[PDB]
Amino acid sequence: FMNPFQSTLWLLVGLSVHVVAVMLYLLDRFSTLSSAMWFSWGVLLNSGIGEGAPRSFSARILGMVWAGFAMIIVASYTANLAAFLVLDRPEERITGINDPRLRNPSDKFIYATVKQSSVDIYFRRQV
Amino acid sequence: TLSSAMWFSWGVLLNSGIGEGAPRSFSARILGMVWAGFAMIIVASYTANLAAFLVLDRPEERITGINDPRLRNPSDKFIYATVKQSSVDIYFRRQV
Amino acid sequence: LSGQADMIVAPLTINNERAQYIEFSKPFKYQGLTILVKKEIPRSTLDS
Amino acid sequence: LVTTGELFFRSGFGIGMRKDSPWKQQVSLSILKSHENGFMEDLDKTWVRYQECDSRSNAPATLTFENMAGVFMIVAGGIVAGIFLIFIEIAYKSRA
Amino acid sequence: NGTVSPSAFLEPFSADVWVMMFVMLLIVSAVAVFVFEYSFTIGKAIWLLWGLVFNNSVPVQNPKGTTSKIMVSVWAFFAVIFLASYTANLAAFMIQEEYVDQVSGLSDKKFQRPNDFSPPFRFGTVPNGSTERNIRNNYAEMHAYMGKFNQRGVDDALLSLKTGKLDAFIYDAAVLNYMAGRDEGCKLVTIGSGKVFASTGYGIAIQKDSGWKRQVDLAILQLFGDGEMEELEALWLTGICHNEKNEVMSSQLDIDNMAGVFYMLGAAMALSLITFISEHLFYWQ
Amino acid sequence: LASYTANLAAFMIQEEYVDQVSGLSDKKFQRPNDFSPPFRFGTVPNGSTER
């Protein structure tokens, strides 16, 4: 619900949706509140419900910009969700014996081996 | 009719929102269902493949300095030079 | 060394073959050696 | 042209001059003063680092007009064919 | 934590194809009107076209002419291709986006005067050293202000800056580079891609007017020339992770990186409302 | 739909490849003749692997 987003954005988009519905309703009434709100909601979530239509040309402009805004929101959400599923943690790991973490470990790296074996001679026999 | 079926089948694939009609039998319903599924899966696959192609970039040689095996053991198809009588030729001769 | 000039204000490197004859001042720019190689040309969108 | 690899034989520059001369201490002090004050930072910003087109490694490009032909030329051909088919249909409708 | 890209929603599809698609809308609307000529209106046609190109969100009424259906279908194909390409390009740009350090350098507005800005841009340095002397003479006022947050150790300063109590640090380049490359991860970075100011160097101080300087200098230069110093660097002054074009991740799409769309929406709504109010007097007249 | 498209796009980046031949015990080497494409492999004679 909110992994590739923030709650503040959800509240802001809800408030903007209601404000747009109010603005279109006022514009229609000046020269249909249910029709405006249902049209805006149906545009937002891409649903076939709602048969209302605007009349004034200005309302046509708001409808066009609303459709563009919904399209850009959906596309950005999908792209960002895709981007999060590939870029994981770097997860650095020891390369081998040449990793600097092995030469001089102070207190947070303890590495051991089996006592009296064939590997102890290898370390002891090199200065 | 033939024309109505063709219009519906084209519109459902192309997402055109055109045509008037609907199937009546209870098997044509499933046929239209799988047809819509085919359209959706083909569109999603197209988008995903285009996105994948628009990201991955083929690498190249990109010589990594003086420890690269291309420089250390030279062949007849890789020639590299430097200006003569400088501080570079001295550094490449004082060593063994 | 032939008395013709008195300063070599120029891109002169510092090493051990020269520093036995002339005296170098403190460096005014640090650097090293680096390879330079030509680069290829990227791809395009082909047939859309 | 691009630059690769890592720096080796990191030895700086210098102002050469003969072994016996009275300018050595003053010249070294003047160069050190110019470094500490900030004059060389101004000098570098004007003659060596005025910057030009970058190279980067990935360079994600923006989709320009280079892909337009196979879409808008297709649209133009389609509308021309639609005009032709409209003419054909209006001719055939009179017959039947 | 995050990435800076306020123009992400407009970075793909530069403003050269939008005009092309617009003039395409007008030209196909005109040709469709001409075809339908031999209850139609240009407003319904343009509304249908604009709604169709944007994922068919607007429930518009479709025409009835047979020739119009072909144009509608080909436009639908064009719109589907358009949307697919746009989504792919936006994903590609979002994956490959990079990050830039907040401060450009020492000589910057954020450092020159912090009093006329957000809550104070806290910084400091350990006193009794060359860095304090270098800072004092060039910028007296910064030394006057900075003399409130002074630590007594590199480790303490790193610990304090890790927890957010401090937000900047000024010290020698070599020790800072080593600390950045050998910490618990490398969530710490140095501003600029390896930037150094007032580069001087290190040295071996000797007594005045002695007879040892020539031999020591020649020996050091021989060590440099013979190649017995690069391995020393690799052994004693190396790190784990490389701070070169990391671009770790970003999330939550905060309003800082997206306010452009709402600003444009508000401007368009205001313009439409103003022109709607203006049209009333023309209609009355 | 958004999640499905994102997951498919993410998966297509990760897609690796699998070697054509499993090993030397594969049926392609055992029965070369009964394959529509003519399989052919060669070795340097007068050595040790051939023996």
From Swiss-Prot, chain C:
Subcellular location: Cell membrane; Postsynaptic cell membrane; Synaptic cell membrane; Postsynaptic density membrane
Summary of the tissues where the protein is detected: Detected throughout the brain, in brain cortex, cerebellum, thalamus and olfactory bulb.
Record's comment on post-translational modification: NMDA is probably regulated by C-terminal phosphorylation of an isoform of NR1 by PKC. Its phosphorylated state is influenced by the formation of the NMDAR-PPP2CB complex and the NMDAR channel activity.
Residues involved in glycine binding: 11, 13, 18
Superkingdom field: Eukaryota
Domain notes from UniProt: A hydrophobic region that gives rise to the prediction of a transmembrane span does not cross the membrane, but is part of a discontinuously helical region that dips into the membrane and is probably part of the pore and of the selectivity filter.
Subunit structure: Heterotetramer; the NMDAR subunits are modular and harbor tiered domains that function in concert to regulate opening and closing of the cation-selective ion channel pore. Forms heterotetrameric channels composed of two GluN1/zeta subunits (GRIN1), and two identical GluN2/epsilon subunits (GRIN2A, GRIN2B, GRIN2C or GRIN2D) or GluN3 subunits (GRIN3A or GRIN3B) (in vitro). Can also form heterotetrameric channels that contain at least two GluN1 subunits and at least two different GluN2 subunits (or a combination of one GluN2 and one GluN3 subunits) (in vitro).
Family: Belongs to the glutamate-gated ion channel (TC 1.A.10.1) family. NR1/GRIN1 subfamily.
Functional note: Component of N-methyl-D-aspartate (NMDA) receptors (NMDARs) that function as heterotetrameric, ligand-gated cation channels with high calcium permeability and voltage-dependent block by Mg(2+). NMDARs participate in synaptic plasticity for learning and memory formation by contributing to the long-term potentiation (LTP). Channel activation requires binding of the neurotransmitter L-glutamate to the GluN2 subunit, glycine or D-serine binding to the GluN1 subunit, plus membrane depolarization to eliminate channel inhibition by Mg(2+).
Protein name: Glutamate receptor ionotropic, NMDA 1
Species of the source: Rattus norvegicus
Source taxonomy: Eukaryota, Metazoa, Chordata, Craniata, Vertebrata
Swiss-Prot record, chain F:
Changes after translation: Phosphorylated on tyrosine residues.
Glycosylation site list: 46
Superkingdom: Eukaryota
Tissues with expression: Expressed in the hippocampus including the dentate gyrus (at protein level). Detected in adult olfactory bulb, brain cortex, hippocampus, striatum, thalamus, superior colliculus, with much lower levels in inferior colliculus, midbrain and cerebellum.
Subcellular location per the Swiss-Prot or TrEMBL entry: Cell membrane; Postsynaptic cell membrane; Late endosome; Lysosome
List of residues binding L-glutamate: 48-49
Function as written in the Swiss-Prot or TrEMBL entry: Component of N-methyl-D-aspartate (NMDA) receptors (NMDARs) that function as heterotetrameric, ligand-gated cation channels with high calcium permeability and voltage-dependent block by Mg(2+). Participates in synaptic plasticity for learning and memory formation by contributing to the long-term depression (LTD) of hippocampus membrane currents. Channel activation requires binding of the neurotransmitter L-glutamate to the GluN2 subunit, glycine or D-serine binding to the GluN1 subunit, plus membrane depolarization to eliminate channel inhibition by Mg(2+).
Record note on quaternary structure: Heterotetramer. Forms heterotetrameric channels composed of two GluN1/zeta subunits (GRIN1), and two identical GluN2/epsilon subunits (GRIN2A, GRIN2B, GRIN2C or GRIN2D) or GluN3 subunits (GRIN3A or GRIN3B) (in vitro). Can also form heterotetrameric channels that contain at least two GluN1 subunits and at least two different GluN2 subunits (or a combination of one GluN2 and one GluN3 subunits) (in vitro). In vivo, the subunit composition may depend on the expression levels of the different subunits. Found in a complex with GRIN1, GRIN3A and PPP2CB. Found in a complex with GRIN1 and GRIN3B.
Annotated family: Belongs to the glutamate-gated ion channel (TC 1.A.10.1) family. NR2B/GRIN2B subfamily.
Domain comment (free text): The extracellular N-terminal domain (ATD/NTD) endows NMDARs with a unique capacity for allosteric modulation, harboring several binding sites for small molecule ligands that act as subunit-specific allosteric modulators of ion channel activity.
Name this polypeptide is given: Glutamate receptor ionotropic, NMDA 2B
Species the sequence originates in: Rattus norvegicus
